[PDB]
Each structure stands twice: as C-alpha cells, then as structure tokens.
Paper text:
In this study, we solved the structure of SDN1, an exonuclease that initiates miRNA degradation by trimming their 3′ ends to generate unmethylated miRNAs that can be further turned over. Arabidopsis SDN1 and SDN2 belong to the DEDD 3′→5′ exonuclease superfamily, characterized by an active core consisting of three separate sequence motifs with four invariant acidic amino acids (DEDD). The Arabidopsis SDN family belongs to the DEDDh subfamily. Our structural and biochemical studies revealed the structural features of SDN1 in substrate recognition and provided insights on how SDN1 uses its DEDDh catalytic domain and the RRM domain cooperatively to degrade free small RNAs and trim miRNAs in miRNA/target RNA duplexes or miRNAs bound by AGO1.
Full-length, recombinant Arabidopsis SDN1 (residues 2–409) and a 10 nt ssRNA (5′-AGCCCAUUAG-3′) were used in crystallization. However, only the N-terminal domain (NTD; residues 2–137) and the DEDDh catalytic domain (residues 138–300) of SDN1, plus nine nucleotides from the 3′ end of the RNA was clearly observed in the structure. The C-terminal region of SDN1 (residues 301–409) lacked observable density, but was not cleaved during crystallization. In the structure, SDN1 NTD is closely attached to the DEDDh domain through a large interface (1379.2 Å2), and the DEDDh domain interacts with the RNA substrate (530.0 Å2). SDN1 NTD is composed of seven α helices and could not be attributed to any characterized protein family by amino acid sequence or domain architecture. Various hydrophobic interactions and hydrogen bonds (H-bonds) were observed between the NTD and the DEDDh domains, enabling these two domains to form a rather rigid structure. The catalytic pocket of the SDN1 DEDDh domain bound four nucleotides from the 3′ end of the ssRNA substrate. The backbone carboxyl group of M147 and the side chain of Arg185 formed H-bonds with the 2′ and 3′ hydroxyl groups of the 3′ terminal nucleotide G10. His223 and Ser224 on loop 1 (residues 223–225), which connects β4 and α3, formed H-bonds with the phosphate group of A9 and the 2′-OH group on the ribose of U8. In the active center, SDN1 adopted a partially active form, in which two magnesium (Mg) ions were observed at occupancies of 0.57 for MgA and 0.97 for MgB.
Numbering used by the authors: 2 to 246, 253 to 269, 275 to 300
The structure:
RNA sequence: GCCCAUUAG
C-alpha cells in the first residue's frame, strides 16, 4: 500500500497527471472514471490542482499492484531530485551540497538509471514524505562485495552499512539464490564461508534499510550504483564519492591517500567507513 | 551512449 499522508501537493498532482496520461486502471480504473463515480457534480474540474490531497489520495489509493506503485514512487523520487536542483546554492547545506553535486554531475543520469524494475526491486518512497523529511541531512554509507554469478549477472555476497560516526550497522554475508561461477578472490571470502551463513538475503536487507530510507537517509558510497544495483534498491538521495571530488573517475584508495593516509583484498565495511569518512571530511572541513 | 578504458568488484 501507499502512504500519502504528508506528501506534498505538487508531487501528488504530478502523480495523478501521469496516471491520467498513461490511462491506468485501478480499483475504479481511470482518473475521470474515478472522478465521475466518486463525484456526483458535473461541476468538478479535472485538473488535479483541485485542492485537497484527499481529493488526490483517494484516487491514488485505487492502485494496488506493484508495477503502478513502483511507477509512482519512481516519479516522486525523480520529482524530488528535480526540486533539489531548482533551489539555489546560497544557503544550501553541506550534505545537500554533496547530493546536489552527485546528481548534477552528467554521469549520473545514465549510471543511476535502474529501470526496468524486476519487481524484485525496491523503490524508496521518500518521494512522498513532507519536505522537512525530504531535506533530511543524515547519512549512512553502504558498500558491497559481489561475485560474478553463473548468470553473468553479478551477485551479492557481503554487505556493510556504516553510520555517520563509523559505528557499524549491517555487516553480513549473503548467499545468492542462483549459484556462482567466479568468486573473484582475492577480494572475497570463499563459497564454503557463505552457504553455512545462508541466513541473509537481499529482500532482508531491503527490509532492513527501508525505515532509514523513508526517514530520508542520504546514502553515501563510491560508485554507489553498482551497490544499489546488486541490492535492488532505487533511492534518490545519494552521495557518490567518485562523482563529487578530467572525465575519469577516481579510485577509493587514492582519494583517501589523497585525503589522508590509507593491492589487498577488499572490505566493504572498511570501504563504507572510508567513503563515509570522506563525506564527513568535506562536510565539517571544507575541501577541493 | 553499445563495446573500451577509469570506477567497481
Ligand atoms: Mg563501493
Ligand atoms: Mg567493497
């Protein structure tokens, strides 16, 4: 179900418009189908700038299936990053400075585009909180370790999330639904390690991250999209370390090395903490 | 923009 309580009207309007546009069917089908069965008056205008969310939300809650809901969440997130761009620099806050940069940077539009949604995907809904939540400034750095799977589809074996204070938040071993051909060790554990530690899955870590995301947490990371992509999470507020600070994108070891002293196997929790540490680095102390 | 390379892993 869809939670439109404190959503902004602008967003709400736009969503309805899209629905109208794609002519989609809900419990009651169309927006004007709906607006006619639900409004007796001929008088009623169709421009969902007719005022109370309630006029909007009700329709919006007509739509039950996953596809339409991912659709609407998606649009609302996009809409968010859009309002994000349309506000001037002048008193914007260092964390939002950062997200500004890493969605403004021209690479973003292509890299962080995830559709089509497998409908194993989780789409964040922070696109429907109120503004004060949307502009929330709290960070948590993700990172993954993946191994190429039989499918040629990459897969999730180790995930780490880390908080603003480098306190470690989700460190885990995942064993993928589909088997795997190449474990890419050095930078990995071995399959023997995981199967026993079978417990964690991807839907589990979506479950786990969802309350952070809906409270509007800024994810932070380095080439964070490869991560999101294996995690099957599409959430607008992001900070990519590569993108922020020559077309070529940097590598983490050189940024730290560049930022502060740091060929050995990779560690997603050190990774996450390092990413986080750079983000904080800019936020408190100004850099370039 | 696909391949490439950097990033990732
Ligand atoms: Mg990374
Ligand atoms: Mg890593």
């Amino acid at each position: 179900e869809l939670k439109l309580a404190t959503a902004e009207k602008q967003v709400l309007d736009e969503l309805v418009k899209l629905l109208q546009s794609r002519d989609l069917r809900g419990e009651n089908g169309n927006w004007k189908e709906f607006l006619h069965v639900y409004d007796k008056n001929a008088d009623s205008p169709s421009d969902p700038s007719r005022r109370s969310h309630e006029d909007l939300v009700q329709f919006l809650t007509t739509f039950k299936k996953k596809e339409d809901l991912q659709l609407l969440k998606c649009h609302a997130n996009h809409l968010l990053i859009e309002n994000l761009k349309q506000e001037s620099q002048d008193e914007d806050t260092p964390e939002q400075m950062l997200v500004r940069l890493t969605v403004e940077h021209p690479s973003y539009s292509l890299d962080y585009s995830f559709k089509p949604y497998s409908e194993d995907w989780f789409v964040s809904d922070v696109g429907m909180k109120m503004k004060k939540v949307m502009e929330s400034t709290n960070m948590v750095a993700v990172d993954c370790e993946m191994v190429l799977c039989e499918d040629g589809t990459e897969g999730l074996v180790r995930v780490g999330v880390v908080d603003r204070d480098l306190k470690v938040i989700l460190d885990e071993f995942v064993k993928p639904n589909k088997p795997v051909v190449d474990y890419r060790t050095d930078i990995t554990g071995i399959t023997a390690e995981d199967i026993e530690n079978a417990s964690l899955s991807v839907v589990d870590i979506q479950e786990t991250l969802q309350p952070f995301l809906s409270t509007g947490t800024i994810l932070v990371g380095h080439s964070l999209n490869r991560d999101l992509e294996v995690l099957k999470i599409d959430h607008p507020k992001v900070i990519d370390t590569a993108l922020v600070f020559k077309l070529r994108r940097p590598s983490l070891n050189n940024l730290c090395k560049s930022i502060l002293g740091y060929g050995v196997p990779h560690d997603c929790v050190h990774d996450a903490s390092a990413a986080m540490k750079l983000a904080l680095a800019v936020v408190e102390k100004r850099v370039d």
